[PDB]
Design a binder for this molecule. Structure first.
Ligand code: CHL
Ligand code: CLA
Ligand code: CLA
Ligand code: CLA
Ligand code: CLA
Ligand code: CLA
Ligand code: CLA
Ligand code: CLA
Ligand code: CLA
Ligand SMILES: CC(/C=C/C=C(C)/C=C/[C@@]12O[C@]1(C)C[C@@H](O)CC2(C)C)=C\C=C\C=C(C)\C=C\C=C(C)\C=C\[C@@]12O[C@]1(C)C[C@@H](O)CC2(C)C
Lengths: 196, 98, 197, 42, 153
């Protein structure tokens, strides 16, 4: 377990934590309270991004959008979201912002008030149906799996955002389609090396 | 949505966040900062005879401790967000990014 | 091991232990031993890449002229159309060079660090000295004797200056290397640097 | 010559020799390559 | 054509400046005999002027409304030769000097009275140290990595 074999491990990164492959070049997690805050925020970023990747790929495969087309309707005054074709009757810009704020603020601020640093990241109980917590010998494996898939989804979200930045008006499945059609001449190389 | 509805809903949803959601955070931050300390002592403790924290206005009854000053604060945020909504909606402005 | 300028003495930092140690350090660069063991690796890699480069920009030309196989002349070889783009080659030459050069970096940082595969953890590499990995980098298993290392560094030092000669025989001449050799062998006393300038 | 090489080693004599040589170098370069505003040799 | 500047080989004001300076030199050339030495010096200056303007034409210099070569120092490759290719050629040479005079100061730092080598420069030691700064960038790089570049007080 090491992000780069041959590099020395930080003394505070032993490998016991889930996904602790010793990757701290800049030295951010040197004090332990900041490291617990960073673990909580890593898992939060991870869970949001890996929930987001289906919400980006699926509505582009079948939902008739491309994950930014789902936002353009709010940029134009007059027009509401096309949740699978049908328009939503819950208003367009301001009231969805009200519901989003009033819902996620309550959820995330009931998350904030937790003091146990393990429940701050792995609460369980109501958030653990199906009883996938009653055996730590596999729960550690599942925590490593969560961390790994979540870091993968975070990198995939960088892929989404930067493929949107390089190609302004497309989506990731269109990028994969272009790479499956002509894989050599339609890759990143035309952007890292701009011809003009 | 009529403007009375907008003002009432946004104010209600602001002091609802203040009464139930963002109360313990605001109050624990208040206790953390505590008071303005002039050379260790507070402003009233060092003297000045005018910076005394008023308690006749903050003693109001509530099982959780809501006071009239939080009613003004959550509610100033309320009227502010309401008028932001109202003016932003009444201004037919096209962001026209696309 | 020998001396490059007999009037001068080999410096104290070049004890003759290293391969190719003719005592050439007039400008005192490898005075710190860490700099010495870093510049050993820089010499080896620049020289091996220069050997491959010279062999890949001269041997095409001595085969183009005699007509065994027609291939471009190393400066018109970029503009040719290949099965990929002009930048896709750079993408691949980044993806799978970053991996091999950072592993070489971890080797020249601490020697015994990176010798086993990430995937097939059984197929390790023998504990060779730094800059000389061995194993699958030695399939024919020619021994890395010190005479062989000296021959390596000599051909590499020669190929480095050969590449420099190529770059300057295309920068202020315009023609290829082997064509310049044939021009020299045509009339050696009239086809030199002091006729071009 | 002993103690003349120490005088010529002194900071002003050595500075005037170095800057005379350097100034002649720059002067003859500007004769050879006058009126330069770019480096086009790459 | 960056920054709203026509190139100098195409700028009419640049050619007008050339013609104005050439006429200003020719009006001083009439007063001398055509075979005389002042006249030949003026003619050499005339050819120098003409090839100066031609060279500012061919080297990609950009001319403004005033009709003078402007330098685009931003980073455009077309104009690296205006600032960056000289600039590196400065930072090399300058960094030669400082890497020499520093190294000398480290080589005479361990003397008994090291101030009598500041005013009386050891020409052998200085000549040994001068070419150490030829390839100075790798020495400065490594000394930064080895910590020998910054004293530890
Ligand atoms: C080392 C190295 C050197 C010394 C050169 C030298 C050159 N390349 Mg080049 N390249 C090098 C690595 C690479 N090149 C290329 C792909 C190209 C292309 C596609 C082109 C060059 C061209 C050039 C010329 C630019 C002037 C010059 C002869 C240009 C050229 O040869 O113009 C006629 C040109 O079009 N190179 C790749 C793959 C990404 C490299 C790795
Ligand atoms: C914001 C997201 C986020 C956060 C808070 C963390 C936090 C953490 N990671 Mg994780 N990680 C992430 C994203 C994140 N990571 C992603 C995307 C990857 C894949 C590329 C990884 C891969 C990874 C590995 C392999 C390891 C960690 C480890 C760690 C811990 C120590 C490092 C530290 O203190 O950094 C705190 C970070 C902070 C934010 C930095 C923000 C910078 C300044 C901006 C970077 C811009 C970026 C390049 C733009 C693209 C800490 C719990 C190590 C550990 O002990 O695991 C428990 C470990 O071995 N991480
Ligand atoms: C790769 C994704 C992944 C993985 C492996 C886990 C794994 C885990 N989570 Mg995490 N979690 C995730 C995503 C993930 N989660 C997301 C996206 C959210 C939001 C959360 C929110 C969350 C909370 C709030 C809690 C956990 C907990 C747990 C643990 C027990 C539940 C379990 O075994 O899930 C296994 C998961 C699967 C087998 C995945 C099944 C397939 C999914 C549902 C497909 C969905 C695709 C699409 C939406 C349709 C375990 C370490 C609990 C914990 O650690 O405390 C004990 C806990 O309290 N998670
Ligand atoms: C693992 C995530 C992931 C995946 C699968 C892809 C896939 C793709 N990208 Mg995206 N991309 C990513 C991350 C990703 N990218 C990130 C993080 C960035 C930020 C710089 C970008 C920025 C980007 C641009 C700007 C462009 C692409 C393009 C492409 C396509 C061609 C490949 C290419 O040009 O090389 C790009 C390859 C990389 C940048 C390397 C990142 C991925 C490696 C493998 C990291 C290791 C991840 C993990 C361990 C392995 C996962 C593999 C698994 C799915 C099988 C292809 C559909 C091009 C395109 O569609 O046109 C294009 O122009 N990508
Ligand atoms: C990549 C270039 C490179 C590098 C890093 C080295 C590095 C080394 N050489 Mg090798 N060498 C080279 C090219 C190189 N050499 C070439 C081309 C020649 C033939 C001219 C030699 C001939 C040579 C001899 C004969 C000997 C060495 C020795 C050494 C060692 C001590 C000197 C030192 O630190 O130089 C560091 C060098 C550099 C940092 C390179 C600077 C290059 C500049 C930029 C170019 C200057 C020329 C310019 C184009 C005009 C060290 C391992 C000695 C040895 O074996 O000791 C163990 C020894 O006896 N070298
Ligand atoms: C090191 C090195 C590098 C970077 C190159 C690079 C190149 N070689 Mg060269 N080559 C080398 C060593 C090298 N060669 C050596 C050691 C030999 C022997 C050759 C013999 C050789 C031949 C015979 C040909 C190339 C060709 C090519 C080009 C295409 C190669 C490819 O993948 O397709 C490319 C410019 C080809 C080319 O330019 O024509 C299409 C070609 O026909 N090379
Ligand atoms: C012609 C110059 C030359 C010479 C004399 C050597 C000599 C040596 N190399 Mg080096 N090497 C060279 C060029 C050279 N190499 C180049 C150009 C590369 C880059 C492809 C390498 C890459 C390389 C690696 C990666 C390794 C060696 C190893 C070795 C040693 C064993 C192999 C051997 O003797 O076969 C010499 C073979 C020939 C003379 C045939 C030349 C054929 C021509 C086309 C020996 C010290 C290995 C070693 O030291 O083992 C521990 C090792 O790990 N070398
Ligand atoms: C590596 C060895 C090597 C070899 C065998 C040659 C051989 C040759 N060169 Mg090249 N050259 C080299 C290195 C080399 N050069 C280097 C390092 C440079 C950069 C300074 C040049 C720059 C150069 C130019 C600019 C020209 C030649 C030319 C020539 C040819 C005539 C000789 C001449 O003008 O002397 C010039 C020799 C030198 C400037 C230095 C030679 C030093 C080597 C390393 C000693 C080898 C013994 C001949 C084929 C001319 C041509 O095309 O015909 C020509 O116009 N060479
Ligand atoms: C700091 C502000 C400044 C700047 C940036 C310039 C810049 C310039 N001035 Mg101006 N000037 C200035 C102040 C300045 N001057 C002042 C204060 C005065 C009054 C004293 C003048 C008076 C003045 C006049 C009267 C003239 C200039 C000229 C020039 C140009 C110099 C051309 C030349 O001879 O260099 C050529 C390059 C060199 C001399 C450097 C050579 C260095 C040696 C040979 C080593 C380099 C090689 C080295 C070994 C590395 C090789 C790499 C590797 C192989 C090792 C240039 C545009 C001249 C010009 O052309 O007008 C535009 C001109 O006629 N200037
Ligand atoms: C790596 C290298 C060259 C690699 C070339 C390659 C891959 C070429 C590839 C290609 O051609 C092909 C195959 C095919 C083409 O289609 C494409 C390209 C891409 C063009 C050169 C290094 C070249 C390196 C050179 C020339 C280095 C010279 C160094 C010298 C002379 C050092 C001298 C000193 O440092 C010492 C030794 C000791 C100090 O104390 C004193 C001083 C004096 C400072």
């Amino acid at each position: 377990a090491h992000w780069m074999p041959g590099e020395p491990r930080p003394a505070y990164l032993d490998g016991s934590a889930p996904g602790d492959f010793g990757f701290d070049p800049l030295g951010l997690g040197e004090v332990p309270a900041n490291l617990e805050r960073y673990k909580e925020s890593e898992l939060i970023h991870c869970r949001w991004a890996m929930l987001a990747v289906p919400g980006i790929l699926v509505p582009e495969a079948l939902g008739y959008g491309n994950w930014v087309k789902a936002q353009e309707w709010a940029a134009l005054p007059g027009g509401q979201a096309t949740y699978l074709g049908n328009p939503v009757p819950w208003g367009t810009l301001p009231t969805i912002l009200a519901i989003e704020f009033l819902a996620i603020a309550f959820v995330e601020h009931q998350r904030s008030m937790e003091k146990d640093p393990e429940k701050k990241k792995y609460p369980g109980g109501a958030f653990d149906p199906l009883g996938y917590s009653k055996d730590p010998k596999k729960l550690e494996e599942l925590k490593v799996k969560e961390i790994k898939n979540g870091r993968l989804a975070l990198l995939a979200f960088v892929g989404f955002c930067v493929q949107q930045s390089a190609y302004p008006g497309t989506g990731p499945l269109e990028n994969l389609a272009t790479h499956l059609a002509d894989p050599w001449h339609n890759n990143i190389g035309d952007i890292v090396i701009p011809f003009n | 949505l009529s403007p009375s509805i907008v003002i009432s809903l946004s104010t209600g949803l602001s002091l609802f966040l203040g009464r139930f959601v963002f109360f313990n955070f605001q109050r624990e931050n208040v206790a953390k900062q505590g008071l303005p300390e002039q050379n260790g002592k507070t402003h009233f403790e060092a003297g000045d005879d005018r910076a005394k924290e008023y308690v006749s206005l903050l003693k109001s009854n509530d099982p959780i401790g809501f006071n009239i000053v939080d009613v003004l604060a959550w509610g100033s945020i309320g009227h502010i967000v309401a008028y932001y909504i109202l003016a932003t909606s009444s201004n037919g402005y096209d962001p026209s990014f696309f | 091991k020998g001396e490059w300028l007999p009037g001068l003495a080999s410096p104290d930092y070049l004890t003759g232990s290293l391969a190719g140690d003719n005592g050439f350090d007039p400008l005192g660069l490898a005075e710190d031993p860490e700099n010495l063991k870093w510049f050993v690796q820089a010499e080896l890699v620049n020289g091996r890449w220069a050997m491959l480069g010279v062999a890949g920009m001269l041997l095409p030309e001595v085969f183009t002229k005699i007509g065994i196989i027609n291939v471009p002349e190393w400066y018109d070889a970029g503009k040719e159309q290949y099965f990929a783009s002009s930048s896709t080659l750079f993408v691949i030459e980044f993806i799978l060079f970053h991996y091999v050069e950072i592993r070489r970096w971890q080797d020249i940082k601490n020697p015994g660090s990176v010798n086993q595969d990430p995937i097939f953890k059984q197929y390790s590499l023998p504990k060779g000295e730094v800059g000389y990995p061995g194993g699958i980098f030695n399939p024919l298993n020619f021994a890395p004797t010190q005479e062989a290392k000296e021959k390596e560094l000599a051909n590499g030092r020669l190929a480095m200056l050969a590449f420099l000669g190529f770059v300057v025989q295309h920068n202020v001449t315009g023609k290829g290397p082997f064509e310049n050799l044939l021009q020299h062998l045509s009339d050696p006393w009239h086809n030199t640097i002091v006729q071009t300038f | 010559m002993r103690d003349l090489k120490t005088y010529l080693s002194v900071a002003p004599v050595l500075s005037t020799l170095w800057f005379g040589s350097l100034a002649g170098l720059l002067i003859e370069i500007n004769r050879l390559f006058p009126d330069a505003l770019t480096f086009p040799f790459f | 054509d960056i920054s709203g500047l026509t190139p100098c080989k195409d700028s009419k004001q640049f050619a007008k400046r050339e013609k104005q300076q050439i006429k200003k030199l020719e009006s001083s050339l009439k007063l001398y005999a055509p075979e005389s030495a002042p006249a030949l010096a003026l003619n050499a200056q005339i050819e120098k002027t003409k090839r100066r303007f031609d060279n500012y034409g061919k080297y990609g210099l950009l001319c403004g409304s005033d009709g003078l070569p402007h330098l685009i120092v931003n980073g455009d490759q077309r104009h690296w030769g205006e600032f960056i290719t000289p600039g590196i050629l400065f930072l090399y040479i300058a960094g030669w000097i400082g890497w020499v005079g520093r190294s000398y100061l480290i080589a005479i730092s361990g003397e008994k009275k090291p101030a009598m080598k500041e005013i009386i420069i050891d020409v052998p030691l200085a000549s040994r140290i001068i070419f150490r700064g030829f390839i100075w960038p790798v020495a400065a790089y490594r000394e930064f990595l080895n910590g020998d570049l910054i004293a530890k007080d």
